[PDB]
Design a protein around this ligand. Structure first.
Ligand SMILES: *[C@@H]1O[C@H](CO[C@@H]2O[C@@H](C)[C@@H](O)[C@@H](O)[C@@H]2O)[C@@H](O)[C@H](O[C@@H]2O[C@H](CO)[C@@H](O[C@@H]3O[C@@H](C)[C@@H](O)[C@@H](O)[C@@H]3O)[C@H](O)[C@H]2NC(C)=O)[C@H]1NC(C)=O
Ligand SMILES: *[C@@H]1O[C@H](CO[C@@H]2O[C@@H](C)[C@@H](O)[C@@H](O)[C@@H]2O)[C@@H](O)[C@H](O[C@@H]2O[C@H](CO)[C@@H](O)[C@H](O)[C@H]2NC(C)=O)[C@H]1NC(C)=O
Ligand SMILES: *[C@@H]1O[C@H](CO[C@@H]2O[C@@H](C)[C@@H](O)[C@@H](O)[C@@H]2O)[C@@H](O)[C@H](O[C@@H]2O[C@H](CO)[C@@H](O)[C@H](O)[C@@H]2O)[C@H]1NC(C)=O
Ligand SMILES: *[C@@H]1O[C@H](CO)[C@@H](O[C@@H]2O[C@H](CO)[C@@H](O)[C@H](O)[C@@H]2O)[C@H](O)[C@H]1NC(C)=O
Ligand SMILES: [Ca+2]
Ligand SMILES: [Ca+2]
Ligand SMILES: [Ca+2]
Ligand SMILES: [Ca+2]
Lengths: 395, 398, 396, 396
């Protein structure tokens, strides 16, 4: 019911021996993948440059059964020419510095953010300003690029996640919402008008008492804020969407209408009134990383950090623990659910990269460290409370 | 609890009419007269006595307010007159008279609204005098403005039409919708004023919860099977100009919501399947079955009349619907038997009433004691510093 | 083990061609059989009059191999004369208007209820008052007929199911409990004294949340209440029984002593107190229509509406999902299980009628819409939790 | 028994006229005082440079009856020569740029931080790095100045509040804990060893839901973190104390042992484990700004933002809303309670500066906008739950 599509002991690249032979050109233990998203039998895998020796930040892998496809070599997408790191480390609009979590739209486009920053522990290296890209997946050619101005974000240290707001009819009318978990802000991107602005709000912060974890016997505390945003279907009478959002270090989910997010003058305010609202409590130890809203079912899928699992929730039901169900659980293989994503084919995709092991312990290249699963949404929710045909619980 | 006023209190209900009615056999009986409502308008309070038994001289009545409070055993005056409240001996349809009226509501445009059930519910003998009909009363001149008889296609008798909720336009006042809660046939009848047309909704959520219908007030155990009872409307949505209808059955610990866009739609009412248009809001709490509730337009707070807990609770509609986001603002085990009504006036006050119906129905009703009570409390002042205050943040689990 | 016995593409009757050649004396799409019960190689199939063009409300079919017998012709039972529809529509004591679910007891009698009411879309027509019948099965001769007074139930709108309580010794001492899913009541009938009284309770109602269904990709919601009752074996000392009852729109099962049900004085109360009991929660999407109690094994068989299945439960074991087992499942054929009956031979019987296809989509007469099955109880519960010799999964 | 000591309509400075006439030298509305602290009949008032037109950032007022002293002219302290803002805006270790909340110890010293930064809306101007001063209050001469290195804090943007940990025996052995409400950190200053380090922790952050205010009908939200720290009496043997700390936008109070704060190695951990403990919940709408510990009684006083009030708590009684009492409430005058200090004479001192009227509304210089109050601690707690002899209301 949940199949493991991809797994790695370590990450390897399809680049010239020139790059592999050069000193500190490729360090295996340094290459931690951060996302894997799906598009027509192709899975895009990112390796953010938090370390030296990372040949390509954006990558692709071709799918062929049977699964799991073991240790697939990553090919620098769209071309190694872009994923090359300049030796002079200077700004370049035709180079990809660091990419985290891309998303695929219905228009055969790949959207991502090049942070332009390398978070090497010891030497944080700001190469260039953060940029929003779109790639045509039919032609494998870059379409648009937008550099995010200083007035919205200073560096791009925390721009690790994005949510796409594409009009159902016009494929050109696109907004993008970026979650900054480091500076506790959300950056809205008007693609159509090549404009952007930023929101600041108390709800983008962590909950002081809810940033403590114990995973695989390792304890740690994080202060990471707004991390994921999930958009409902456009309202029939208003055309706007509910933005479900949460901090990494929180057991709470909050909501805001896109009408607020799409409005620049609203961002510039000192006080947002009661535009941003609390949806409610997700449960004990129910801190989530990435969550996604499946349009056809109206079901939100949560990646649960502490519980080493993936849960779901039907949006029509009241937001309550007894109205959510765990669809998958794996204490051995889910160490940190780094990414969750919903494809154009009715599947929920999720990924674990064992980052906690690396950070706080020793990762072992003998074992399989990085995993990618998939599940058919309609099939996975059938019996459960996440099924729209199943009534909510009495509590 | 220590800033809520007991405005009116009776031991019995007496009337102001010609002595020919009062002296005639079975024209008036002490125990048979029970008011189901207390409503406030500009220093005069409308009280109604529905005809559950014989000897009810008048149904819809009015009382003038004068300190000290509580005003003890006031003499009820038939409103708008006695000549619309006079029971016919022939019992034919009186298109200009009032048989049984339950809970009226006061809108912003100085009007009173109520339903003429046209049906008397005497134990042993049920009598359908006339068809159900709704009124509008000019409270300035005391003159009836409109009457509308509801077609058989919507309600058969008017047996359970014991509750009304008003949906008046913010700007215009000719555009008025009404939502009547039928707790007996388990339905909601909607009325379109400007068009003078009415239709009805049937739904599973209008029924009681089989397990949550058992009560025990004053050591008297009983169970009722009554359905949809009260509806409360949020302020119009700035983007859609529609409202959220909050509704619960009498015998339920659950609250449900529905957009007024659905309720105001005739073609939607004739569907056999309403989809996900009606939704569960959530659980009110253990032993939190509510009779009547109201939405305060200014604060955005719903006040619940709690049946089992002998209390009035509040909830800020901005906060998630959960017991820890609710507070009891008034509680009276000795004086509150059955909170039969709750209404919000135009002056920012919560008006709630207990009529001791349980003791009459299942026990002894003594006229030596006080059996009827009307209360009022300042909303902005009673919620200040509680979870119900919009400026106070919501609560969380751990 | 579980076998299909009778299945129809459509239903036709063995009646004069005069009724069949009348202006709409038979419309094929309007005839939906609601029940099928067993007695010594005979099966009674009922077509309640919910539309126009139905010749016979009560019928009979003969069991003759091979199974499943294809498109059997329905023979009006006991006769056509009684099953005939009066064009004058006047109350008639020796006729039959609408019959739902008959039952068969240990004293060779067939028992049913004629509602006397025809629920046609546009015009609901009450022809006569509801009537309970006995039929001597050996002779085919109507034994008794009691008309239910206005004091107990007004219309017979929802008297679609009955459950028989026969004394284990004397056949004259019979109590019949009728389920009313429309007005939310249980009508109790004393066969000897020829009296009756009704019960009203909160537990006969639907559960507001648990009344939505999606069968064959078709969403719908019903407000249907108390639908089926199952009577246990008389307690060896008190000689009373436990009546298990559920609403159609409920996942909950409830229990009541037969001492309370057989008591007229208790029937006129306003508050029954602690008498009616909740047994528990059957499970997610475990709403059931008609269920029966097998006396020999002490096992209840449920017909599950949403799960498209038939399940069982050993009454000795505590009521819990883990202590229950699904004995048959058919997502293709079982759309809505309309009847479940237990014959005198130790078999469980269940039927599907494709009713929701008629109501919300269109019915195809070129496909088999109506199905009846039989299962041997002792063989079917053998390797399951329902076996009285096997221990429970949960001690509760 | 709570008496108002000082009040201003507007703040004025005793300074050469050439400074007052200079272009944007003195803008009355910009001069919002932020602290008033008592030492031997002298109250030190600060005006942090968050706007242009502030002649002097640290000032002194000489207390004399009758109270309240209306519109006292602020005298620059120690002198105007240190307080005067350099036009060229270059760094200078002999200049005071921005001082928020000074504190007086037992050793006749005035301790404060010059943030070195001007938080002017539109252009924040970092003139110099933040520094920590001590001034001998007997001679009015500065005793020491220490620049906080860039490893510990970035700019001094949020170094608006300090707490003294003075050795009960030795005056030369001091630690100062500084709260950074902007970057959510604590800076620890080792006075004897002229060293410093920082602590980062989740508990220094605001609580997302508890940062919404409405004072005087003015709705606003702040994201302000760790604001105040209050130290218990030292352990007789080890001399370690309990540090009571809270964020501005939080209803929760936390504790940590000074054993931890005074440990440079502990501050370099990525994970602090169980060292920082949640003490508990202060009550609905009980967001505190500044609080203080009074050694003689063991009572902590809180300045309450939303409640326009000062509350207290006996540290011996469990930390719970009912174990706390409001000792002073003034909705008219207390608008933003900007400071609370505990002097060497058993008094509690508190201040309201109406900052929120300047920020989100308008300030009228005809009204008294800045107020300073004092109260005798033992007299103010006599009857209340805060009295050490009175029993707790809850065991918790
Ligand atoms: C885009 O957003 C801007 C303001 O942000 C919000 O707008 C709406 C979503 C509302 O929820 C509002 O409360 C919130 O501030 C704004 O440019 C624009 O419309 C706002 O709508 C306000 C209410 O109608 C209105 O406020 C007006 O001005 C203020 C300063 C006062 O004088 C008020 O008395 C007066 O009503 C104003 O048009 C504007 N708000 C502001 C602050 O300028 C909104 N546009 C959309 C949604 O299309
Ligand atoms: C101050 O800082 C160190 C970390 O704090 C604690 O360390 C544990 C002992 C425990 O109390 C935890 O709650 C917390 O993490 C602490 O270890 C240190 O003690 C010294 O630590 C040095 C390195 O960690 C080491 O050289 C010594 O062995 C240890 N000294 C001992 C245990 O006597 C604390 N005290 C200092 C530096 O004086
Ligand atoms: C910050 O990183 C510096 C960069 O040095 C190199 O950068 C890349 C080109 C890679 O090849 C990488 O592997 C190299 O380290 C480091 O200098 C420095 O760490 C140490 O520096 C000394 C002196 O150069 C060197 O001998 C040692 O091996 C280390 O690399 C690092 N500084 C900090 C504080 O993290
Ligand atoms: C009453 O409810 C109807 C539900 O059938 C609404 O119909 C909807 O309207 C759209 C556009 O006209 C159709 O595509 C579709 O029939 C849909 O269900 C109808 O609008 C509504 N009436 C009013 C006045 O709101
Ligand atoms: Ca961080
Ligand atoms: Ca009822
Ligand atoms: Ca029905
Ligand atoms: Ca801040």
């Amino acid at each position: 019911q949940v199949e493991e599509v991809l797994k790695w002991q370590q990450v390897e690249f399809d680049v010239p021996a020139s790059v592999l032979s050069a000193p500190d050109g490729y360090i295996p233990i340094n290459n931690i993948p951060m996302s894997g998203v799906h598009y027509k039998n192709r899975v895009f895998v990112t390796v953010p440059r938090r370390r030296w020796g990372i040949p390509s930040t954006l990558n692709v892998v071709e799918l062929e059964p049977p699964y799991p496809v073991t240790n697939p070599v990553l090919k620098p997408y769209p071309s190694f020419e872009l994923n090359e790191l300049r030796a002079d480390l200077q700004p370049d609009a035709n180079r990809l510095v660091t990419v985290y979590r891309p998303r695929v739209d219905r228009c055969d486009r790949l959207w991502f953010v090049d942070t332009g920053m390398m978070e090497i522990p010891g030497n944080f290296t700001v190469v260039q300003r953060p940029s929003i890209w779109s790639i045509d997946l039919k032609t494998n050619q870059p379409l648009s690029r937008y550099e995010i101005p200083q007035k919205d974000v200073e560096t791009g240290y925390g721009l690790t996640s994005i949510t796409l707001d594409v009009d159902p009819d016009d494929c050109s009318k696109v907004f993008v919402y970026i979650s900054d978990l480091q500076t506790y802000r959300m950056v809205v991107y008007d693609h159509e008008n090549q404009k952007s602005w930023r929101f600041l709000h108390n709800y983008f912060f962590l909950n002081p008492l809810e940033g403590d974890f114990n995973i695989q016997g390792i304890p740690f505390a994080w202060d990471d804020g707004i991390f994921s945003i999930a958009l409902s279907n456009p309202d029939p009478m208003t055309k706007f969407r509910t933005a479900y959002f949460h901090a990494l270090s929180s057991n709470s989910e909050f909501t805001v209408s896109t009408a607020v997010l799409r409005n620049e003058t609203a961002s510039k305010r000192g006080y947002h009134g009661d535009d941003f609202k609390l949806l409610g409590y997700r449960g004990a130890q129910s801190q989530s990383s990435i969550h996604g809203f499946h349009p056809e079912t109206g079901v939100i899928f949560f990646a649960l950090i502490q519980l080493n699992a993936v849960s779901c929730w039907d949006t029509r039901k009241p937001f309550a623990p007894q109205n959510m169900a765990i669809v998958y659980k794996n204490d051995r293989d889910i160490i940190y659910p780094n990414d969750l994503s919903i494809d154009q084919e009715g599947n929920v995709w999720f990924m674990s990269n064992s980052i906690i092991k690396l950070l706080y312990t020793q990762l072992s290249l003998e074992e399989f460290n990085f995993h990618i699963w998939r599940a058919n949404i309609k099939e996975i929710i059938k019996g459960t409370v996440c099924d729209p045909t199943v009534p909510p619980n009495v509590d």
